[PDB]
Each structure stands twice: as C-alpha cells, then as structure tokens.
Amino acid sequence: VTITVDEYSSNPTQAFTHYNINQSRFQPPHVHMVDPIPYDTPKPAGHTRFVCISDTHSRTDGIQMPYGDILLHTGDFTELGLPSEVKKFNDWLGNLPYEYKIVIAGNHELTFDKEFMADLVRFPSVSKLKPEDFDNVQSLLTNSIYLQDSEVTVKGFRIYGAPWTPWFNGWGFNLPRGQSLLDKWNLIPEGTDILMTHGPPLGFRDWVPKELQRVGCVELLNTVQRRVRPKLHVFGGIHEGYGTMTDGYTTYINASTCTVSFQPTNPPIIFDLPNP
Template sequence: SMSAKPRDEDIEDEYAGEVAVHPETHRPTYVWDTMKNRSSTGYRVVTPVCPDTPKPEGAVRFVCISDTHNQAARLIQTLPAGDVLIHAGDFTNTGRPSEVKRFNEFLGHLPHRHKIVIAGNHEVTFDRQLMTEQNSHVFMSFATALQEVKQEDWKHIPALLTNCTYLEDAEVNIMGFRIYGSPWQPEFCDWAFNLQRGQPLLDKWNLIPAGIDVLVTHGPPLGHGDLTTSKERAGCVELLTTVQRRVKPKYHIFGHIHEGYGVTTDNKTTFINASICTVNYSPSNKPIVFDLPTPKIP
C-alpha cells in the first residue's frame, strides 16, 4: 500500500541527476546512514601512495596538507617532494597578519613549483562579511588581537600570501589541471566562512564548474573524512551530492574535521582529509600524496 511518508529511495529518485537540498540536510548522521549502503554512494578506505615511491613517468605529483594551525614550519624537513602543494585551510588560528606572514614564509621555503591555498574557519580576517559586521562571538573574543588587524587594514591580508595561489570560490589551471578552491563549511561556533546547511551552502557549491579535476574545500562532504570523535557525521550533504552528481572531480581535498584524517573513495572520486593536526592540535599526521597523469596538450 502507498505510504504517505516517502521512503528514502523515493527521495533519492526524485533528485536523480540534479542537486537539490536534501529534506534532512540538518541531520547529516541520519542522511549518511540512509545512503551508505547504496552503490551510488560507495565507500572504501584507500591506502595512499607512499611519498618515497618515485613518481611515475609523465605524472604530476600533488602533496596535500590542511589544518596546520601555525605549526606548518614543523613540516619543513619532512614534507614530501612534489609538483603541486595543496593546503585546505586553517593555516592560522585567527588570521592575524603575523600568522599569515609566518605561513607565507614557510611556503616561500618550499621547493614545490605550485602552491594552492584556501582559507578555513580560523582565517577570521579573510571573511569580509564577518569583519565588516563584527558581530561574531569569535570576532568579539579576539577583539584585542584583531586591533592589530584594524590598523593594518584587514582587506589587504589575503595579499600577504605572495608565495601561493589563494583560491576563494575560484578556479586555477595548473599544468593542465583544473583546480577549484572554496572555504565555506556548515556553521559551527560562529567562525569564518560559516554558512547554514542546505540552500546557503548549496549556493556556494553551485559556483563550482563541472569538470574540475581537483576540488579543494575546507570542510568534508558527508560520509568521507567527516566522522567526529563523538561519532557524528559533520560533512555537508549538498557538497557530497554536488561532487557525486555534477562536478565529479578526480580528487576532493579537505580538512577541518581533524579526526577524520585519511583517504576514502566512492569508486569515482578519491576523498582526502589532509588534516595535519589531530583533534588536540598536535601536528602529527602525515601529508598525503597522489599522482595524476599529465593532461595531453590538445
């Protein structure tokens, strides 16, 4: 007999081929439990490439890090060699100029030919709305520290990143690869680049062009690298559906949920949570490396 309440399968069918807000988007743990056994949302843990493995001929090597929280300098001696370094946000604790300059100096010492950086929720001064309105509890609790910022004019802080390509809802072509970066994540504790789950975040994901090879976001999608110590799923439902149904990147790099560090796949996209810091902000996780064949020049 017909049921008044749609089954999850019906909800899934209703949205097939398009990305719309999931009716239970505010309950990511529940949504993942309804999805995780389906082939369309396959899930498998992946053993990453050992950084000591020589790069295959004709390949481009990517080195992924995230969530270094002012401790990136500790990686200087051990960071694997590669062509493209990617940092998926939270390189500072509050985005003060002194922190950003320190991180930029670290980048300047690295031999990697290309460096891609996005902001995370800790790069408070990079969030123009938050800095303009000054109504976040984070802004108020850091008011003294951020006085340094007002004098120096926060609008110029991203320009302190002279040793990398900073991506904020933007794409760059590097060695023939289309790489897109975005800092937004589901709201949590009123930090930078927080947005409500559902349409506000989907509006940002709708800016990602289809056909991107490497997607970089600060937060994880639902189900991949998003399990918190309290066993909740913190990932964004609409980021997962955008990745799986529309953008289909080869790799999706992120951090934010430090305890979600590691590599997984849905058999189409490889998902990398590259958090260097543990949940206790100890910078002890290893950078994650992957290789892609160099795109043929048409």
C-alpha cells in the same frame, strides 16, 4: 544535472544512514579506505604528484615535507587570521620547492571573511585590528595561488577552491546547511579536476568521535558525486578524519596535519594524477 537541497540536508548522520540503507552509498566494494603511499614511491611520467596538507594552525616549523610537484593546502593555516600569522605561513611556503602552492582559507582565517570582520562590532586580539591592518591579508600570500570561490588551471588541471563550511561556531566562512551552502557549491564548474574545500562532504572522513555524528555537507557530497565528479576532492576541517577514501571514481583526501589536540603530526599525503 541540477542539484537541489537534500531531504536529509540538516541531519547528516541521518542522511548517511538513509543513503546506506537505500543505495549502499557508503558501502564496499566501491567505497573504501585507500592506504597512503610512501614518499619514495616513484612518480610515473606524465603525472603530477600533489602534496596535500591542511589545518596546520601556524605549526609549520617541524613538518617534514615530501618530494612532489604541487602543494594543496585546504585551510586553517592560521589560528585567527592575524596578518603576522599569514606572513609566517607565506614565508614557510616560499621555502618549499614545489612548482605551485595552492591555498584556500578555513574557519580560522577570520580576517579573510569580510562579513565576519564587519560583524565583529569572543575575539579580543582580532577586534584590535584596524581596517588597514587586514585590507590586504590575501595579498600577503605572495608564494601561493589563493582560491576563494575561484579556480586556476595549472598543468592542465582545473582546480577549484572554496572555504565554506556548515555553521559550527560562527567563525569564518560558516553558513547554514542547505541552500546557503548549495549556492556556493553551484559555483563549482562541471569539469573541475581537483576540488579543494575546507571541510568534508557527507560520509567521507567526516566522523566526529566526541559527538558520535557525521558532519559533512550533504549538498557538497551530492554536488561532487552527481554533478562535478572531480578526480580528487581534498579537504581537512575534521582533524580526526585525516586519511583517504575512494568511491570508485573520486578520491577523497582529508589532509588535516593537526590532530584534534592540535599536534601537527599527521604526515603530508601524496597523491598522483595523470596529466590532462
């Protein structure tokens, strides 16, 4: 399967309507919300319980974390990517019992985006940083496996992560819709079980009420549904979209911990998958 740039790539709201009209792509019975399961749900044997969070924005102190096996964090774990914020998040991770903690960056991790940092010469406190201050920011995540257009196999699960989102404010890892993003999604390997991205695919937990617009990536949706077909696609990005959906094969989890007003009150989402 070769994914090409969609006819409606630049206009996600129109893409959504188009695919609903022509293919019922976002319609029942196959597409629907999935209710969360409570933390005391027994985990069946031969399964891994994934604890999904995102968009914590350095507000980790009060988060009540559930039993599980592997933590997935889909970015915006800081406000500006300051090394001190990365250190605080890493300290928090180290006190969690999970066997593995897998992390990707989001747009707020400015110091992780080396092209953004170079272009700096809007962000006075980030501009103050000297090269030696942030040459090792990802190295600061000693209690995690950090993914960036890269993958890890853990307990047999193939997990791929990438930070890129459609251009919004020119913050970290922003790219134009279309081929620029498709070039990144084409790196996701076919047999990926769990895909982590910072933002949503078109149509799944990507509604922005203030704009009355869908904002998910159309190339990402086509990649997920047509080429890669992971069992789980976890992301955040659009805080308002916190919650879970399915298309009948892939489960889509918007794990945004913060609300749109940056209150860290959305509970972590647990999700069980059978071990491969």
